[PDB]
Symmetry: D2
Subunit: 301 residues, 4 copies
């Protein structure tokens, strides 16, 4: 199947170079625009599915409008955030560093499927983003731990644990609780993926004392360095990641300097466990944030 | 089912009173001797299967010879210990307190099925023994954790990690205890061959979990042990001379409490031969190091 | 902190015997009927026995009803309300039903943690239902240097937000207590933790669970515990500044009812004399703040 | 003292660019050789002390001999390893990836003070090295945790296929303080890592929990510098102030780097107490260095 993949890349006039065994690839030979032909878009789609995070360089032509137009080719853009309104209405303007391991917006039923990210303002040092493959983490589980997580369910919430305070106030202006399976089946690749991250509050049918120990054990397996791709930002860079197969972490190692990146996120579907059972909403309505995408299986998977 | 149990107790002339919801019962109406009739032995076997730990009182007639003779009615006695030779030849003479949660001799393939214990010397206060039901702990697991343990395997070893016994004498004992090395891979969930009940097999002889790294071992071991030793699952007995305890070593852990200062405490134990554990799929434990055939036979169990 | 010849003289003079039931905790007291008209010297002998042994049990106290238990408890301190928030389960005594199966020190979510409780059974199941206590003084004594250095500097937020639970949490209490308190009457250092603890000051949530579990395991180590099988006529008294306890729910669906009187305490102080701090709530209706008297034996 | 630092770098003709807040800097303007003048050597020493890990690039002139000769300017080179003899006699020839967080050779009394590392063979992707600042980790502890580690001691051992047999051919056990005071900077640094077997006066059950807690504070991403290797790169790190980890994310490809380590001294705790040897003799591996305080600290 590998040769078929390279042929698809070739025909689309792109090159895709692996940057890590389990995650990360650099794409060259293409300028991201809203008028990319369908075949090239699908080549990017395939590269993303396989490699989980893609980086593009020298995209100096991109502005907010151009980034938005390109992102629309891969899916239906969500509102910037379900609760945060003060940092953009079309794109999400992330300031500082998102330094906690997470999958984006897992506290709603319709977890977004992907994000497109480009830097706007960068510090003189530090400030990398790192991603972890939750697909590799599942693959690496021994049988008894697989038996555990296949049956495990978790409640996700936006009420997670001067300006930083104000932001949290807006972030939690309305309360969301969603019960998701800890193992979801990727609707386009069929791969099993761990669904956890910092929005997780509890595990169904388990006491609080056991939550912390098991959460820690599973997160450490996800964020194991061998499963991670860490990217040093330069102006002109663009990252695309599969939010159904990763967690990420923005590193706050740049002191008091300003750091700004602009994000477009694409609507996803409701997670299903290994038996095909869907997540359940306890609190909140995310219909104003995005629709529910109808996913399509990739025929190579 | 309970009518049948009541008739068996009645025919044997005993009463069996529950002392806790999940574990422990006191038996009255019988003097433990080597010549007990078969109906009474059957009744004790059934009471033990149901209640996991039995205590008998005012058995002042019992000495070492009598305890051994009674114990042989319940099964075939093992040697006092697989490696310890200096602390009894017919019975194991336990001194101080065995203050760590354990199932007896889980580091061999043939885990002994049961123990008979009587006090010889007791402190003026403290020194209770407490037992936990590993059957109840399994029953109380939520679905995902049960799925975990059903597939989990663990290596048990005799190289494991006060009570009026000197530090020096404890050293000599540990040296003898570990004079030869045993390693056995047991399932964390075993199926009781006589009751069919599932029970957790863990305890302080466990060194590692199969296919899991060391860091994850400590966290999961602690989690499962805390579920086993949860107070609701435990029966704690204050010893008096004349008492006798019998426990199902396939369905319990126990712990002798060192809360009596520098006072002396001595109890004498007889263990009965058991069989090799099987997991919920019928797969047997695997020996890595050691041979326990000098210590005990392998019992052929009978479903009750 | 020991039973010396002076202690024995005090017991003798008061006509009681005090039998140790465990190395670190628990004693049975004989020779006395708990009543509201006990002479001052016999009351002070009980106070001393309690300080030393942390939990006392008395037996064959069949003369006692709620009124009598309250009248006796009054000799040891100022009875609090049954509870800061729970009003529907007693007006003078707290009527505990079922089992309080979580390790705790009573009412640690207020500033004025009650100093002691007097407990007697009213209804008992045919098996099970023991109460067990742990010595938080012994737990501190047994810490090695690095862990003692940790806890001496550690502070924790306690809260009542752990039909009954609705009433229990009808008003919200949060109090920051030191993890190590200095007992105001004995001078002994004691761990102050238990299930009302929500967080540690200056520590993130992940580290909270690990450290809390670690410290609780040292407190509830079997060697530090006294477990009592109740009989009708028994009475227990415990030092709520020096213990935690746990009611065991191992009696199936049977009824279990014990009646409690709690006595007013003071605000904890750390090893530097700094007092706990109130974040939310006012407990002035529950009790006043007791002015303790240090025992001249400690 | 930032004016003094900027002046020392300038006077020695180097630039030192921070690559992370707590750790990592790139040094330019200098070719690493055995004949560097003393003032340029001291500028690198200061840069290393401050930034904990230095990287130099395009050092294509360097071979094993040149790397050795340069390293000699910073200290006394040790044997390649206390027990491993078949993988280099002057330099240590590291193959594969050292994927466990560790401080180098902490199981001896004389923990080496620094290492100089250069790649020889690199995989087509992956294979980065990441370092963590154990100084930053100490700085970030709240009071109660600081009170804990200041009094905590740990036993380190080398008993952590043919290679493992040689690595463990002789047994070393050393009891080190978990907090050491850096003899040249005065900074307090956590001393832990994968060679730690146990904590003094603490039971095994508490060991795993506290070890995991402290290591997580050390390897927290904000405290780490992760470097993608290219031929011609050279890294120098302060082994008294860091841990490191070679990432095994390059499949079955070949990866080889050559190391020179420099002799260190015996750790001291915050009360001036030195580590204690339980088993082993490292006198063949290196001598004990007499350190010098930097007058900038
Ligand atoms: Fe994010
Ligand atoms: Fe035993
Ligand atoms: Fe209580
Ligand atoms: Fe290394």
């Amino acid at each position: 199947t590998d040769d078929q993949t390279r042929r698809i890349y070739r025909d689309a006039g792109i090159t895709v170079e692996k940057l890590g065994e389990h995650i990360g690839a650099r794409v060259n030979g293409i300028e991201l625009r809203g008028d990319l032909s369908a075949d090239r878009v699908e080549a990017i789609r395939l590269a993303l599915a396989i490699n989980k995070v893609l980086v593009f360089t020298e995209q100096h032509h991109l502005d907010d409008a151009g980034q938005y137009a390109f992102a629309r080719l891969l899916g239906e853009p969500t509102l910037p955030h379900p609760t945060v309104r003060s940092h953009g209405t079309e794109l999400l303007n992330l300031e500082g560093a998102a330094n906690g391991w997470h999958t984006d917006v897992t506290f709603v039923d319709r977890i977004p499927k992907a994000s497109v990210l480009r830097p706007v303002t960068l510090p003189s040092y530090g400030g990398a983003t790192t991603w972890a493959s939750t697909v590799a983490a599942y693959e690496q589980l021994p049988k008894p731990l697989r038996s555990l997580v296949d049956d495990l369910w978790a409640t996700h919430t936006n009420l997670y644990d001067e300006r930083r305070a104000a932001y949290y106030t807006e972030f939690t202006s309305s309360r969301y609780e969603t019960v998701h399976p800890v193992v979801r089946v990727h609707p386009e690749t069929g791969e099993r993926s761990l669904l956890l991250g910092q929005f997780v509050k509890s595990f169904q049918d388990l006491p609080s004392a056991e939550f912390a120990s098991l959460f820690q054990l599973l997160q450490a397996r996800i964020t194991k360095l061998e499963n991670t791709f860490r990217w040093n930002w330069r102006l002109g860079d663009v990252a695309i990641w599969d939010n159904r197969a990763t967690q990420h972490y923005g590193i706050a190692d740049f002191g008091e300097q300003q750091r700004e990146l602009h994000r477009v996120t694409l609507a996803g579907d409701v997670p299903v466990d290994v038996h095909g059972r869907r997540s359940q909403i306890l609190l909140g309505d995310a219909s104003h944030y995005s629709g529910i995408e109808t996913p399509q299986r990739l025929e190579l998977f």
